[PDB]
Design a protein around this nucleic acid. Sequence first.
RNA 1: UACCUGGUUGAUCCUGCCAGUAGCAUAUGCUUGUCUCAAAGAUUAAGCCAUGCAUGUCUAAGUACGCACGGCCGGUACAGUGAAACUGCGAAUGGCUCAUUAAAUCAGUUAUGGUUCCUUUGGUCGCUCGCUCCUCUCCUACUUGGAUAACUGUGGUAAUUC
RNA 2: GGCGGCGGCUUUGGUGACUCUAGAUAACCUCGGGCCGAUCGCAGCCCUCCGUGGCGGCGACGACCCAUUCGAACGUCUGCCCUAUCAACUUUCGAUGGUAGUCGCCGUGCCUACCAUGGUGACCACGGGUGACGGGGAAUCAGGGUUCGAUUCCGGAGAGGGAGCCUGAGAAACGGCUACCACAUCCAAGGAAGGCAGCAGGCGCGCAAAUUACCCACUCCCGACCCGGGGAGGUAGUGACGAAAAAUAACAAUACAGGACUCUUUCGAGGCCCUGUAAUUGGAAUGAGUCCACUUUAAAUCCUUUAACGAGGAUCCAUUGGAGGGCAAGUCUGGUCGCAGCAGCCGCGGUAAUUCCAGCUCCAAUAGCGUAUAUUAAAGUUGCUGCAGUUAAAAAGCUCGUAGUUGGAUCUUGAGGGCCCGCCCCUCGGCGCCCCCUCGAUGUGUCCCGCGGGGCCCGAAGCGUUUACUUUGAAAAAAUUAGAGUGUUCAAAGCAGGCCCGAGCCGCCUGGAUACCGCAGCUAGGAAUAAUGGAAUAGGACCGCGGUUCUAUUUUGUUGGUUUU
RNA 3: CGCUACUACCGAUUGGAUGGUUUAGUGAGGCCCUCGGAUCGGCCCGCCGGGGUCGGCCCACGGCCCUGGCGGAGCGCUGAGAAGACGGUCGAACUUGACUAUCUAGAGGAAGUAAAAGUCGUAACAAGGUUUCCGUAGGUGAACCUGCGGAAGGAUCAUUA
Lengths: 263, 182
Amino acid sequence: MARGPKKHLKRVAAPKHWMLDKLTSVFAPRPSTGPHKLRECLPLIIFLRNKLKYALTGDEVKKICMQRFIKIDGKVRADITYPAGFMDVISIDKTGENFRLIYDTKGRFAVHRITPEEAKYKLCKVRKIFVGTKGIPHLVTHDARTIRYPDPLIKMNDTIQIDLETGKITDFIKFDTGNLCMVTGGANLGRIGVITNRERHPGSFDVVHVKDANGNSFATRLSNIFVIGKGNKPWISLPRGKGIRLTIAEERDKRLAAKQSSG
Amino acid sequence: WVCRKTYVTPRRPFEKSRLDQELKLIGEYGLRNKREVWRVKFTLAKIRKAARELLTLDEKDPRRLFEGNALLRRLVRIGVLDEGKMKLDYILGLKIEDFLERRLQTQVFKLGLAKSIHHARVLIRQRHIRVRKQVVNIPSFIVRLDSQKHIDFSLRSPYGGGRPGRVKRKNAKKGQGGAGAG
RNA sequence: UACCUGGUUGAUCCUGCCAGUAGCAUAUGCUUGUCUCAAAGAUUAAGCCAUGCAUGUCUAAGUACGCACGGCCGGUACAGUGAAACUGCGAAUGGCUCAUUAAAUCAGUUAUGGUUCCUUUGGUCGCUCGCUCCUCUCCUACUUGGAUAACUGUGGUAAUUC
RNA sequence: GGCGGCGGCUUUGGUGACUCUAGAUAACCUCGGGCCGAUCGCAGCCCUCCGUGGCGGCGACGACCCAUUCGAACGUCUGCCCUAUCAACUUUCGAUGGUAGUCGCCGUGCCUACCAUGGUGACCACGGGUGACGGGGAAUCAGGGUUCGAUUCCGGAGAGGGAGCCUGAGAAACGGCUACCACAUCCAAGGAAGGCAGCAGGCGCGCAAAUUACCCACUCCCGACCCGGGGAGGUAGUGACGAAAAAUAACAAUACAGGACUCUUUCGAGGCCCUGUAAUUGGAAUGAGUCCACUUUAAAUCCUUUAACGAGGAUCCAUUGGAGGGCAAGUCUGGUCGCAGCAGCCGCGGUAAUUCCAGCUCCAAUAGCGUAUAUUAAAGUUGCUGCAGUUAAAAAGCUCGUAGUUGGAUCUUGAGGGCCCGCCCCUCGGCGCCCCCUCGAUGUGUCCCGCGGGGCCCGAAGCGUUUACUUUGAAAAAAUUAGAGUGUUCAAAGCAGGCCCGAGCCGCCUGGAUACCGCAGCUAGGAAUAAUGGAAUAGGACCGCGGUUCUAUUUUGUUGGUUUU
RNA sequence: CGCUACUACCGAUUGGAUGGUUUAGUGAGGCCCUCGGAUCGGCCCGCCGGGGUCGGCCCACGGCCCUGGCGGAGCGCUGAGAAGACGGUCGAACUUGACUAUCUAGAGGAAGUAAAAGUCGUAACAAGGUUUCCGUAGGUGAACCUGCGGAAGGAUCAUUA
């Protein structure tokens, strides 16, 4: 009777970009509520025992979260299924390994070891800039990190290098034309490159014509456009599969290569 | 979860010319029944139409190329098709028996310890051969090019080299109890 | 696999259905050696349901005055541990079933700038900006009041999670 | 400089858009009835200083008050099965609209006060019928099409039927309650205690459906929480649903019976491929088994691994269907004699039965095969593609005539290279213009020019009448399905996989492609095609302007006054 | 027309059964509101236990006050507040008839199909002994007959200066 919200979640009718299997396990990790909307989010337990595969059972991953070896956004995590969204660093506190959650142009999460220089700041394109009560301006980013006292020259869609040690925002990068933007969603997922064009409509439904690095020019809406810094200026490393765009006849030339070429 | 049939049924029940034509392929290649005829008959109708549809596609289509060059390669990695022709016109010209020769059974009859294709199905079924480090028990196995280069005696066939089971021992018991008088 | 086959009639050409003809998916007839997969109380009873069981849970961190257990280690409240119990949360979800509803569900697309939301993610917590200081006399800040469970026994109860 | 002249500085966050944020003043109140810790664990300090006041982390929990997450519920567009032997429907009960407020999480005839007579239908409304959960998707069909969606997914709906409350963020919860209505229990007669469409299981119904199983390990779930619990689920059982692989023995030797062959005039002989059949087997096997064992997993279980055993035969020994045709294979053999039966249909049987009934032989498929029913095709016997309507079914008695559905013609765009391009009959860019920081003469500012922003006006463009249409993209659950990587020992399939190093490589490494999106929409290219536009007793372009007049506000430092551009 | 089955029809029985409505009735049942005061504390004062002060610096016990106890007191006048209960609110529902639908009994009625070799006459087919048939209208046991207007689907595509 749907007498309250579902507190359960099973597999395959699950997001495919998490790269889960078929009905081999009849339940999903089911990420918690938090900073990002639930489909953007990625459970730790998929990244731990299904991507890095240091564990094999769930009660270990609970105890690994009781080991508290996991710092997402520089903040101590004991959640097996933490709602971590985009450009979220994951500090594996025992192996000394930082990994920032960014998407590929193939369509998969990138196990992507950024430098620890790049782990202190993550670039959050802002969600709102609001004059709160008693006349106080604010910035709140897409991970809902309510930050008082913004910058006095920023406007909408500016990217803040979010100090993951503190919050309490550091320097910004203004929303500018031609910025590097990892285009995410639809047929343009994981595509980085300059903007070069934006289209506006009163009301809703604005498209953004993006020409990426490979030369694929495409008009895909600003919801699909997450700015990651400045044009021809990345701020973390580029993910696997080049993070721009790949063709499938070339991808067989990719998939034939390092299998039986290593060790 | 998901299953399918690997054989096929024609819409004509008794077409005796076909029914004795199917008796040929069993007798020419060593098959179990008409299902082993109908198994490759189930495949080859799809193979020609997949060759037909890619032929009717516009050229320089990746769904024509990248699927098709796989389908070119998949038909050549098993060695049924040769890629010296390598176009959809000739893939419309393939047949059942090109696969039957690339089965494990006939290659045992072509190469190795098979005197008959009755005998050639037996050597797979009674596991006298290893096609790899692999006791392979399936006669409808259809092989690849490299697969025809490692078919040996099995190490569970105690004749031609192998650990004794109970049979060469029984054949020893034919001389050590069949001739040992107990 | 883009097919037909048989049947009108004295014979013939038609129309034309008949019946053969393959797919199927239950019911079933008969039969079945291995090894891999597996639908299965929907049809009929959204029938009644016997019984078995289907959401529990303590953190170094709510309250230890367990009659417990373990100790000298005890006093200011002291126990190591800790049933319970009170307190915190789920229990609504899950599973099951489709009877039902014919623009209704539902599906695709949209919007709440009409609406509410545990939880989580983040800010917000000195003050009455001093009653132009009760908040220095309002003297309770080193902290408040009473009031219950467990505990106990009296118990009553054909019977009761009384 | 107590000002009269004349000038000068001359100052607010977001939305496409809210009477948005923000501001302030006047307050308002919320009582048992908004708010800012009377808490709990871990642990380091400073003390004009000795036990306290100063104080710091760890995290416990809490709330102020919002972002969030989860969404919810309502509102938009597009989309559903059958019926006109359903044509008009809807409100006396608000039907529909407004206004006003009530109330509700809130929009709202939500609701009434009140007012209005609305609102809507042949495009089949209104109503009735449908096992109508719907859809993702499913089966089949060349295509066109046709059947399914209770069914491992999504969303909806109920837990016997309603009603009413409750809890909490979320429930009219039937693994709540309250009562009712239809059922079920104890009763000692007072009362008490109950709803498997949870897992099972049971009955019941039927043609038709398995454990009253095991485990919380795997999966997840809830917690105060690693801990636990879970019939969720996992696990096996049940289990020709159905699917996948494919056995029940080869193999020669022997011999014959020969076909080449060689000899031979042929005959015939030699001669194998042999395959049946012979007596056989000969080594040669194999699980079908049995079985130590390793394995397996919650424990298992099976699997695979197997020491070992398990085939010369009538074996370790396949079936289910058919022979009258259609329809393959008995003009068999016997019996039967229009009987018994058979035969989907066409048909046998009435005595020399190819239809029976059997034998035998053969055929067919095959661990299946056959039947029943169902539906898809075949079926162009529903004909959209693509039916037929003189005489086989099918032009109304005839005509007008609306819906209906169809409809006549007709307006303009050379070069580059061996096609390609733009052309012809203001918001951006931007040749210009002036302003401005000015660029090359010049380094609050000119005259190469807005190129920088522009502003205006161009080639260009809002252009001018627009769409249908087509095209571009976005968007377009997953599964599915198409299909890539992928040796599942083949395969059903999975999402895989592959290495070197001894095993210190303390590793290295491929991957898990791409296709699909009714519509409606969106997007932007096209503008043919189909509709579509204007100037008609004159209108459109040009600041042609004119005279009138309304008013909007910048500067006159400012304000005030009026006055104008 | 005889044998004779099937089938709907229709049907007395204002047959019965089941379901959906609907009038009105009753309204459970909780919700709102009106309450209610079963009752439980505070303040009170009487008295002492302590403290203080105003018998008292013996400011001390106690009077007194604070408070501790305690009860009375006005149970004042409060704080809480029960069952009940108010009227609505939704409304289970049932009743009452109406009402429909479904199912079925249903004597029987009346037929068709089937059903065949029972029976009349010879409809009509050859022009079928009166060529066929329509519409309609009567007739005729029945096949049918006739009239009125048709038609060719007749046996006529053909009668003239």
